[PDB]
Protein: Volume-regulated anion channel subunit LRRC8A
Amino acid sequence: PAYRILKPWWDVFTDYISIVMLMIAVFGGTLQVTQDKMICLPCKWVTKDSCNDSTGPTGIKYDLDRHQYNYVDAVCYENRLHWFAKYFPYLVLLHTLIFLACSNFWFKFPRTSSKLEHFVSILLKCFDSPWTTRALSDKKEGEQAKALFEKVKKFRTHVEEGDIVYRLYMRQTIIKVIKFALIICYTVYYVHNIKFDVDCTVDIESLTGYRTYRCAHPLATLFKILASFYISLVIFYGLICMYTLWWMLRRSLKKYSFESIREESSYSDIPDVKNDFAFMLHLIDQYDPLYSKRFAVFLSEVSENKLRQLNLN
Amino acid sequence: PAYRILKPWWDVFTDYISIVMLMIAVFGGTLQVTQDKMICLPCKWVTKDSCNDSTGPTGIKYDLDRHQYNYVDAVCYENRLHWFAKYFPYLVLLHTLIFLACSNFWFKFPRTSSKLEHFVSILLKCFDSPWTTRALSDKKEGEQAKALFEKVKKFRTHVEEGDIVYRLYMRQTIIKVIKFALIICYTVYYVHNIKFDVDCTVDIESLTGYRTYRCAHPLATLFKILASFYISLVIFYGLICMYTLWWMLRRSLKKYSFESIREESSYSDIPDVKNDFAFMLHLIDQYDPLYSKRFAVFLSEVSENKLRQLNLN
Amino acid sequence: PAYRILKPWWDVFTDYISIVMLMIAVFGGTLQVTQDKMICLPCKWVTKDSCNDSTGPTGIKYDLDRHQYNYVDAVCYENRLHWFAKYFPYLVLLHTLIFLACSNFWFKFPRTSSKLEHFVSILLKCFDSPWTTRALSDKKEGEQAKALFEKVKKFRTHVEEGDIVYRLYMRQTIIKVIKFALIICYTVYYVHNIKFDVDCTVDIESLTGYRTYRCAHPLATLFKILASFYISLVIFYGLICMYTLWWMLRRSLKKYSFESIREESSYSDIPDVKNDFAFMLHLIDQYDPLYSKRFAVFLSEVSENKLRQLNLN
Amino acid sequence: PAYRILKPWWDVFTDYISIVMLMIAVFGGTLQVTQDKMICLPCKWVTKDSCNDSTGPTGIKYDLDRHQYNYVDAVCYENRLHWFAKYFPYLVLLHTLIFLACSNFWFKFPRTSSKLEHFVSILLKCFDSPWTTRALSDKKEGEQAKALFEKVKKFRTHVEEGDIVYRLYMRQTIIKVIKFALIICYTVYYVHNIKFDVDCTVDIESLTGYRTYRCAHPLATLFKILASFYISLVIFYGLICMYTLWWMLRRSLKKYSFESIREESSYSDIPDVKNDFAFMLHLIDQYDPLYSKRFAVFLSEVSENKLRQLNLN
Amino acid sequence: PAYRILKPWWDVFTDYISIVMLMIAVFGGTLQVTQDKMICLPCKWVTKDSCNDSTGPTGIKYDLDRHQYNYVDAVCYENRLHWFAKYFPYLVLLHTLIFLACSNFWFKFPRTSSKLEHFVSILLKCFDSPWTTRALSDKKEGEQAKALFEKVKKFRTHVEEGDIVYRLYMRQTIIKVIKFALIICYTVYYVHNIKFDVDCTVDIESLTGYRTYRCAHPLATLFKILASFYISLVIFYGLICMYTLWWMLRRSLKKYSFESIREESSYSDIPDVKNDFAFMLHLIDQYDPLYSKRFAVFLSEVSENKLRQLNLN
Amino acid sequence: PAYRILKPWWDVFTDYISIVMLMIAVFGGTLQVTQDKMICLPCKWVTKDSCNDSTGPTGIKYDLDRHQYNYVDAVCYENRLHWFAKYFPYLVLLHTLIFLACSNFWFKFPRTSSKLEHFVSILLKCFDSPWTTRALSDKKEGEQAKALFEKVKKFRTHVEEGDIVYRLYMRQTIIKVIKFALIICYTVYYVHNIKFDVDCTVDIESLTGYRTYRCAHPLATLFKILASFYISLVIFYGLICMYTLWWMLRRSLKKYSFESIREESSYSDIPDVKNDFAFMLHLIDQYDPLYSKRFAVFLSEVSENKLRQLNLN
Ligand SMILES: CCCC[C@@]1(C2CCCC2)Cc2cc(OCCCCCCC(=O)O)c(Cl)c(Cl)c2C1=O
Structure:
């Protein structure tokens, strides 16, 4: 629904890179389903499995009908063609689905989804209160504010015991970084293996007569373009993931230094949050600090004290 | 709607695995209806009903036009090819539909659908009531709270007599486990029977002249890849099903023990729910214990006393 | 809308069986319009207008180019092939459409659709009314309660004189049963006429030279698979329809015995319903008896009294 | 908008017949675009521009390569095939579009759309008022009641001068019947020009060498099936239209006799609507008579007097 | 939204005609992408750039394989085929997109979209206020009415100074008329230059061996049908546009004649709107005069004085 | 949502040009993947690696089968065909995606998205309140009037510090202008390369026997048409971007003088906005100046004082 408030800028660029990855994966997949044939001809003069390259010119007659051209095309396409040419779109579709599942497992797991839903509910109610204006700058509104005070205190006593959300959000980015590393380790190593002019030697003499054939796989340049684009796009994804991993392993997100807002607002009775709530408060501060600024007045003892004083008067 | 509360975490992994099942099923189906052909050539020298493997090289002339090549391709495609190589996408699509119907029959059945809707409505209303904050730690909401109290008192007697929800959720998982057992029983046995080389001896000499042929089914490798992926993914599905069946036969879900709320909430008078409401309370406890914690205040005669002296005074 | 209460489980299983029959119909139709060809070859030796079946092997030369292969393919495909092999997907799509029309004509015909929507509206309002709590356990709410009383009395005086809903729901299921009988009557008789090998004798000697041909129909096995699947699915559909017809002609749904509820609710002055209102009373009791549970108090004259002296006092 | 209440039952069957017409039109269209081929062979021996039909058998060699077979297929497909075979899907699609435009121009025209919207709004407000039950069987309800009375007296004077809706819905049905007459006049006359066997005598000897050819249009049987289905289905359409035309020129919908409501409601003072409002009230009665019955209270002068008495006391 | 108020009847027929123009455009486009080929044969005997046209008959042998028929087909398709046969669907797609852009630039331009949105909002608020029923024929209603009065006066002071909507609607309709003139000027001139048979002479003897050719373009009849249909449809479009241009240049739409409603409402104090607002009131009068009747009381000085008297008393 | 008010007219024309660009890009892409063919023929009598062009006419025989023709087509399609003839649709799709990203990045970045949405929300709320018209021409209305005064003061204190929105929306246009310069710089330089006639000398005699081939790219004319259309569309896009860049560097949008509204309304105690607030207020003044004028009252301290006087009274 309105879960955009728990997404930083590095989780949106990820969400669009993982969309264009799906785009190129589907495009390569449908193109490989559509054509992906390889045209093969036999060499007459051959030495050490290499073609010898030895009035008016006339055509060379091989004396083959079409159907055993199709057979040798299928055989040399299956056997002597490197597998990375054949199944590259089906690899990258799997990789981008694993990336999407790893990105959205944090939302879809219920043990943290409930906590996130309750958190966004109480922050929406805290943001849509009128009495924070008086707290920062009638009896029914005061008791309504007291009800918000009690439910915010209940949330604070509830969620500050666990570590599951922070642990899950650590374990998502660490395996994203590992997957990026593995992708870069094999894909650029095998990307040279696709090319156009390819030989084959498939040992079928009893069916055609020739021993060695020279083939021409014609989608190779386009597949090379798509693979290079995929390499650059995965590089960008990995730089984003490495940056956010460094940020989260350096900035010590477990506790929130809340004193800076309270010093200027002169509300000294608001302490630091212990764990698993200060992390989400950091993450919404990464959206904007105004939401965390409006949350001080719903956890300050002087603020409940003026609330009950106004209710008594 | 708001039925996502009733679905545990293992019912979401299942619901996404059963989606990618249908994805690979429709992919195999569209590939098979698009091409699924096979190219056959005859062997001139026959030994043991096989191919004997017996100045420049020249082609071998069979003296066959294209159309009887098409005929022998069709005959060797039907008579000498295993049925698992042809109808595997339709088979896995059928099994995917069986799993989906098994998972949603417990919802669309009306006798349990009515009880589930009633249960989720009273949990939403009890979760939205503000009297829980006063009970754990104006008057007109007191009498509507009394109305909710009477509604819960009616519902508790109304659903105590049943067992249908627990029976259906037992039966659905046990037949899902049986379906897993059969699927892994036959698929891994028959998966070896698809291969790129197939020899056919279809006994048509009056139409072509040759007796034995030698073919090349070009999609065998891709179908083997899809089948192995399907087997591993079914293995994940069945591991989840065996885990949830073990949990059901282990934790004794028929009755509920309620003292873990009452001991720390200081409400000495609370009952223990008997059956078919205890199971649903377990099902929402798997989501979170907070909903069961806020449901305790609507079940105590001392809370009835608090409301009665509250709205009298 | 919210007419889904009026559908029992036997009218939801039917609704998915219709969907899956439409799915197999459109799949067979798109496959048949895609290829559905038939490869044909002539036989060089003829006995009883059929193929006689009479150093190394060599091919047989027929001396026919491609175009007069295609001509004889078309001629043998039209003149000497059973019509059930060609128009089976169109036939089953037509049957699925007429089953859907027989399902939804009851809901789209206005002279009963108006009665159904009025009925479901007043049952929703009567079930959601707050006076049922005190009925089963102020003053202006009493005025809306007696407005509900008067509109229920108006509905009872109006719709009881009809018979059209019961008449239509007779005449829909009975013709569904007749159509099942017809489908099972012809389909299992004509299903054995599809096969892979077919011999056409078409008497075209001035265009090719040969007289009798032999043909292969590669789609025969898959069409037989789909046909057997459709036969089994129709048998299950007709079992559902015969069960609901047996129940409906057994229990004699014209009048309701309302005496069961007043035995425990101690409201002896609640009468029986004559006709064409007890029908949907049964039809909503099949959903759940709670809606008829919370409807007795809105038609009884002692409840009229209880509201009347409540407003008086 | 809310125009579903304005459509009688004879415009419900029409709206689905017009959908199945469009679906068979688009099926024929995709057929005729996708393949719609013709296969042609020459006759060596001719007798008055007709084929004379004159050890082992051998083929007949025509000495024609494939591309001048394609040429003679093109020329014999255009010059010697009837136009009803080629453009029948486009004809039926055009007629379906004209039927839809004819049946919805009555709604899309603004000069009557405004009147229909105002009419359905005031009947919704007449149906929503609780004062009707009080009139048939405390002061603010009288205020909105008298507002509704005054706006009904405004509407009745506003819409009584026109004659536009009745005239347009004359013209709609009468041109629908006329188009029925034309369709059945020409389609069953031209349906016999589609046939599997077609003979062309084009006399292009300078490019092939032969004079006459004997062709085979392969989709003729399926096109004949579709055409016969279309004829029967548009016959059903025309019988529906003729029935509603006869109904509308029999029942004399210009004026509304309205005695049947006042005789059972005891309201001796009510008038008869003159024109152009009587027809629409007949139409909503044809939906159901309840809305026409409930409209008597907002026009009777004694009802106005009772409302004025309740507003004064 | 509900912006159908601001579109007259001549701007809805225009919209539907634009939709069917785009439909035939995309149909012709996908047809021309899918096949659009042409079959060409050489003429063995030539006289003045034309074919000389000179036991049993035998075929003519050209000794040309299929691929150099494909070459001559491509060459004679590019050079000696008229371009209007080639790019007519793309031309008509461009024309219908230009027509849609011209029809919606008036709405999407914000400098007029603001005025249209404010005008339609004010007219709807004037329609929905219940004080109009009192005005044409207790203090909160008067305050709401006087707030509406002052905002109507401020809106009148606002929009009377500009003149941009009328001028943009001028510049819209006049370019629509000029574009129609251009389309009809060139399309009927070039429509005669598509035909089935066409003679090409491309001077390639070093590759094929012949000089001139005879060709056949199989889509010519369908393209001519679509072109004639488009010309008739564009004629209808231009008749509609010239009619509305004549009406709008004849009625002098800048200033309103508001006397004919004040003389029957007996509100003698009402001013005539000068420009750019009276044109909008003319446009709403083209929908219905009821909105003009209800808008009279929200500008009358005696209506303001009656409201002041009601507020004071 | 409500961001359409806050987008000038030069971001709607751009937003439609950048969907026409995507439409022609996807059309070119699907055409190129569908056909991707070019027909090549060998030249016998050659000079300087070019085709020298050195009873009745007869065809020229090359003694080549079809599969060698396919091979030489593939080779001359890869090597001697320019890359701009092949990857132009993918290039223009990439440029379209870059333009769309530069269009929507200023929305999707959260650090400015928060400011933009908060600004548009408070503008909508200030436009919604009726007290503005009273100020520019019941104490509870003053209470939320003072609440909106306070939160507008908080907004003015908050957003006026930074410059990020102005910096981003300047950077986006300057890089769009740079991208325009690059595209126009290279596309018109490379557009001359595509043509129907292309020669190739690929040095493969061991496989065919010939050395030079003359070819024909049958889609070069349509690709040239699409390229010229794209160049014109790019030119119009760049003119729009040059206009908005000149507008930015000419109006000096950093501060906003507020003199006109205070001069016409005699509210002399109004301030001048410093930065990052004047920019967005300019950008909605481009929509209409009335939204800026209705915000004048809420910044006015004499309006604050007169509200204080009304609250005192
Ligand atoms: C007039 C003399 C005929 C002799 C010929 C030789 C070929 C080897 C032995 C003789 C030439 C030829 C061309 C054909 O079309 C071109 C090759 C296949 C493309 C079909 C398109 C598709 O892929 O659908 C076909 Cl089909 C045949 Cl059968 C034959 C022959 O028979």
In short: Residues A 65-66; B 65-66; C 66; D 65-66; E 66; F 66 surround YNJ (CB under 6 Å).
